[PDB]
Amino acid sequence: LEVRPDKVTILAQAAERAEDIDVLRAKAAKERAERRLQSQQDDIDFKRAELALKRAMNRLSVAEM
Amino acid sequence: ASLRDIKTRINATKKTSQITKAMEMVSTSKLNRAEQNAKSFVPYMEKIQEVVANVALGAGGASHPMLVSRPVKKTGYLVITSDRGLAGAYNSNVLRLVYQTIQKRHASPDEYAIIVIGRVGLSFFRKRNMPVILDITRLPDQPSFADIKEIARKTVGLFADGTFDELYMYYNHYVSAIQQEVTERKLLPLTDLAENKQRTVYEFEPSQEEILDVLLPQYAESLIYGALLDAKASEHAARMTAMKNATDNANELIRTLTLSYNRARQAAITQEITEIVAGANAL
Amino acid sequence: VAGTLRLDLAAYRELEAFAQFGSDLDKATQAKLARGARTVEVLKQDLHQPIPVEKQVLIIYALTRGFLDDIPVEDVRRFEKEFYLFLDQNGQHLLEHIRTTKDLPNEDDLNKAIEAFKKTFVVS
Amino acid sequence: VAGTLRLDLAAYRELEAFAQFGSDLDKATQAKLARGARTVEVLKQDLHQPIPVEKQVLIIYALTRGFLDDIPVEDVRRFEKEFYLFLDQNGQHLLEHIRTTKDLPNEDDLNKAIEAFKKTFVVS
Amino acid sequence: GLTMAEYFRDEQGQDVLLFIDNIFRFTQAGSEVSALLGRMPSAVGYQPTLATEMGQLQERITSTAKGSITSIQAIYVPADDYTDPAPATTFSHLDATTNLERKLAEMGIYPAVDPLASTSR
Amino acid sequence: ALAPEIVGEEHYQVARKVQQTLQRYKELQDIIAILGMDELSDEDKLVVHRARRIQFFLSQNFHVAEQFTGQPGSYVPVKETVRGFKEILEGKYDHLPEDAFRLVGRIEEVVEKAKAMGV
Amino acid sequence: ALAPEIVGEEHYQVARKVQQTLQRYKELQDIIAILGMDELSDEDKLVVHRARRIQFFLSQNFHVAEQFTGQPGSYVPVKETVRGFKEILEGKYDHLPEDAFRLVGRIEEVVEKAKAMGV
């Protein structure tokens, strides 16, 4: 809590307008799986492109000339 | 060589150039989003810094352990590295600098502990049998404060337990889309601090000594979060630059291939016409 | 009518290579990718079935004016097949005007006819 | 015996392409890579040194049955030479049976002989 | 055409312009004539007398003490190869080069002559 | 004449190892020219590091070229060059710059050239 | 001769769908071999589920091979094979084992083979 005669400012690490702690915990639990699956999707998206680049590069070495 | 071989080589390098261009575009878009993601953090930091500067720098306040430099017995290290490659010497510079500093100024395995972020750094430090105490991997492209909280508070508590007396941070600072620099920053015991131009006394409640115990760890965690965001931005920029360089190299090679293509094309005809004429002249 | 079809085809041919490697592109590319596929689908044809010039002009105009931006790609052929019958049933005055004058009909009237046909049509 | 050797060699040759650079592979593929490396190492031969078929079949069988997975790569040639020396004075009945019948003997005797030789051998 | 043009500078004594629509057709027709006559071919199948045939035509366009003739010529550059013998032989007589740009034409600048590609001796 | 029974086991092994390293270095040119040295693994970096040193050490200075450069030249015995190549392959001289291996003759002169350069 | 004016609309559509699904299946070879069957979407998994069935049903047993196996062989009409492929594409046999589609002939023999297998 930071209070000034001009303004009042509250520094918090998490906030919610629903006034309920339980719904905040439920929201955190819901967001956990969402961020986990987002990270997995990003990893697989990068890996597919890496495999495609490797396959493309192999053909130059195959073509010895 | 052979005309068909030259044609196949040209096709292959064209395919590689196209793939590299697509990767460059993707990296550019990701960096564009990451810039706004990093920018969205200013007000909280600019307020907490002012509050800490106003509170700590007044009527002494040196009784807190996190404000006095006790004698050094153990040292900590924090390293921030990416999880995926194709970024150049981004990880190599930081790893080399950290290794050189440790080897220069420690010369003993029991004088330090290492905390790392990223699979590349984790593997690099495990290959040398160096001691690692904490590590987290597989972070999202645009992480939030909800994933670094546990490791940040664990590090703060580890320092508060007296395991080590000081630690430093090593990461890349995003200067420009083409320039990135490695920086070393001292996190705690925060012996050096700057005061605000305007300061006002506060009515402590319930106690000035009790306020600092809750105030300080949030400041440290905010510093760590800002450093992580900067590192992510620098990584994206480096990846984009590397992809652009690869495209340029392939485009350079194509024409040098085409010249020999043309020479072989002329040679084939000049051989075949002479052969036909010589065969016809026999009768 | 045929002014912008060349540009749309060129843009789709240039941008079609990078579609499979990501979806984080800017919103401008999405419109190009959505329009190129529909143009390619419209450009197809069957065997031994010539199409009148007036009908070709009308369908290409409908493509170029963005009336097909909401129709799914899979139903373009059936949409065109039903639109030909609808034009035969009710677009006789527009077809006669096109045949006589070698020029486009009233834009408001043809837009109203297109809207009526779109209301009649059902997406599968 | 030759079929599984051919399959292993083909799999190793196909899978070796993706290990040039970039991210590392998994242990399931690393086991195949190690098996292929051992297969390639075994096939090497010296100059003017013919080898009898009754010993070739035995060494290839020992390769294909997985008895060589515990031995480092650098010791394969010495292991093969010592195995030939051991077979020269022990297990001659197996060689006689192979020569007479053109077929493999019972698998128990081969397994116990290989285990005894593995116990006798010393890894450098 | 050249002997039509020469008369004005030889007698009247004035500067004359000469235009050749395409020069590659001349060389290809000479090659066809040589093949019909039945001489042995050359490096890339052309006629043995390509250089002298080109010279005998390019040497009559000069400036005298009482007149001059200058020519503007168009070249095809087949197969987009600049080392082809016919373009190589034609390029040995040129003194200037002008280029036209479709980008400038679209932008609306006329005569859309490229200011960077054009060179002059 | 390159046979184990004519030249020697050590010479044969050293020559075979040098040829193998040179071939393996040659096989990576396509990747190096495009993607650079960053994507290589730990073994490939060491292979390139030693291959460059071997390639530079293969050079020599002659007596005839003295009249154009002023360098007297050298005469190198077979045992000396074999020992030098074996020591290089063993990784003893990995900390010296690669420019010190050019036109040096014997292995011992590499160290003095490096210390004259300032390493 | 693979044109709708000669073979028929149903035959043309069935052949086109089979070709499309086989071509789609072929593109996942490297991804499957490297990263395993996991990380795949729910659609590609069904595609590879049906592609194996189609590929195995494409086989047949011959009359001349009876002397080595004891299987008499069969002669399959175009209408029967088209109907069987249409049913497979529709998916009436998604629960049958994979090995039941090997060397059967008509579609109705797959059910008998599966019943003999104990399904």
UniProtKB/TrEMBL annotation, chain A:
ATP binds at residues 16, 22, 25, 32, 48, 55, 59. It is found in: Cell membrane. Residues 23-65 form a coiled coil. Residues 19-64 form the ATP synthase epsilon subunit C-terminal domain. F-type ATPases have 2 components, CF(1) - the catalytic core - and CF(0) - the membrane proton channel. CF(1) has five subunits: alpha(3), beta(3), gamma(1), delta(1), epsilon(1). CF(0) has three main subunits: a, b and c. Belongs to the ATPase epsilon chain family. Produces ATP from ADP in the presence of a proton gradient across the membrane. This is ATP synthase epsilon chain. It comes from Bacillus sp. (strain PS3). The lineage of its organism: Bacteria, Bacillati, Bacillota, Bacilli, Bacillales. The chain holds residues 68 to 132 of 133 of the full protein.
TrEMBL record, chain B:
Keywords: ATP synthesis, Cell membrane, CF(1), Hydrogen ion transport, Ion transport, Membrane, Transport. Gene3D superfamilies: 3.40.1380.10, ATP synthase, gamma subunit, helix hairpin domain. It is found in: Cell membrane. It holds the Pfam family ATP-synt. The keyword Signal does not apply. GO terms for biological process: proton motive force-driven plasma membrane ATP synthesis. It is a peripheral membrane protein. It comes from the Bacteria. GO terms for cellular component: plasma membrane; proton-transporting ATP synthase complex. InterPro entries: ATP_synth_F1_ATPase_gsu, ATP_synth_F1_gsu, ATP_synth_F1_gsu_CS. The keyword Transferase does not apply. GO terms for molecular function: ATP binding; proton-transporting ATP synthase activity, rotational mechanism. Belongs to the ATPase gamma chain family. Produces ATP from ADP in the presence of a proton gradient across the membrane. The gamma chain is believed to be important in regulating ATPase activity and the flow of protons through the CF(0) complex. F-type ATPases have 2 components, CF(1) - the catalytic core - and CF(0) - the membrane proton channel. CF(1) has five subunits: alpha(3), beta(3), gamma(1), delta(1), epsilon(1). CF(0) has three main subunits: a, b and c. This is ATP synthase gamma chain. It comes from Bacillus sp. (strain PS3).
From TrEMBL, chains C, D:
One of its GO terms (molecular function) is proton-transporting ATP synthase activity, rotational mechanism. ATP 1 binds at residues 45-46. The keyword Disulfide bond does not apply. GO terms for cellular component: plasma membrane; proton-transporting ATP synthase complex. Residues 1-117 form the ATP synthase alpha subunit C-terminal domain. ATP 2 binds at residue 45. It comes from the Bacteria. The keyword Cell membrane applies. It is found in: Cell membrane; Membrane. Keywords: ATP synthesis, ATP-binding, Cell membrane, CF(1), Hydrogen ion transport, Ion transport, Membrane, Metal-binding, Nucleotide-binding, Translocase, Transport. Produces ATP from ADP in the presence of a proton gradient across the membrane. The alpha chain is a regulatory subunit. Belongs to the ATPase alpha/beta chains family. This is ATP synthase subunit alpha. It comes from Bacillus sp. (strain PS3). The gene is uncA. The chain holds residues 378 to 501 of 502 of the full protein.
UniProtKB/TrEMBL annotation, chain E:
It comes from the Bacteria. It is found in: Cell membrane. ATP binds at residue 121. ADP binds at residue 110. Produces ATP from ADP in the presence of a proton gradient across the membrane. The catalytic sites are hosted primarily by the beta subunits. Produces ATP from ADP in the presence of a sodium ion gradient across the membrane. The beta chain is the catalytic subunit. Belongs to the ATPase alpha/beta chains family. This is ATP synthase subunit beta. It comes from Bacillus sp. (strain PS3). The chain holds residues 232 to 352 of 473 of the full protein.
